[PDB]
Design a protein around this ligand. Sequence first.
Ligand SMILES: [Zn+2]
Ligand SMILES: [Zn+2]
Ligand SMILES: [Zn+2]
Ligand SMILES: [Zn+2]
Length: 124
Amino acid sequence: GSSGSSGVECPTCHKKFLSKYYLKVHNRKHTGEKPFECPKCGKCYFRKENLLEHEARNCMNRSEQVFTCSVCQETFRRRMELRLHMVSHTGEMPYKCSSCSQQFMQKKDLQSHMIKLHSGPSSG
Ligand SMILES: [Zn+2]
Ligand SMILES: [Zn+2]
Ligand SMILES: [Zn+2]
Ligand SMILES: [Zn+2]
């Protein structure tokens, strides 16, 4: 049935990809001991409660690579989206700017933003 094409393969789930890059980032999950994991698909869930929900909320199903929240188990076809969504759970992003008052998830992400956008090689 389902077929793929020239590319790498996951020595864990046996899932081929277009480029190693994706394969690696994908394996990120596999690695790292976990307490529980959906016995239907294989989604590790630190908290049991979360695991149970998911099973009902959503499970393995031929569909575009999406992301699942960690509080409401939402659905995001993109990674960044989830990041901009999590803020709703914690009010707002963990990091913020001062000149523009931007928002970021990482400290370095902000510092660099102020060192390039605010402190770029241009005078604009
Ligand atoms: Zn895999
Ligand atoms: Zn599942
Ligand atoms: Zn959420
Ligand atoms: Zn800024």
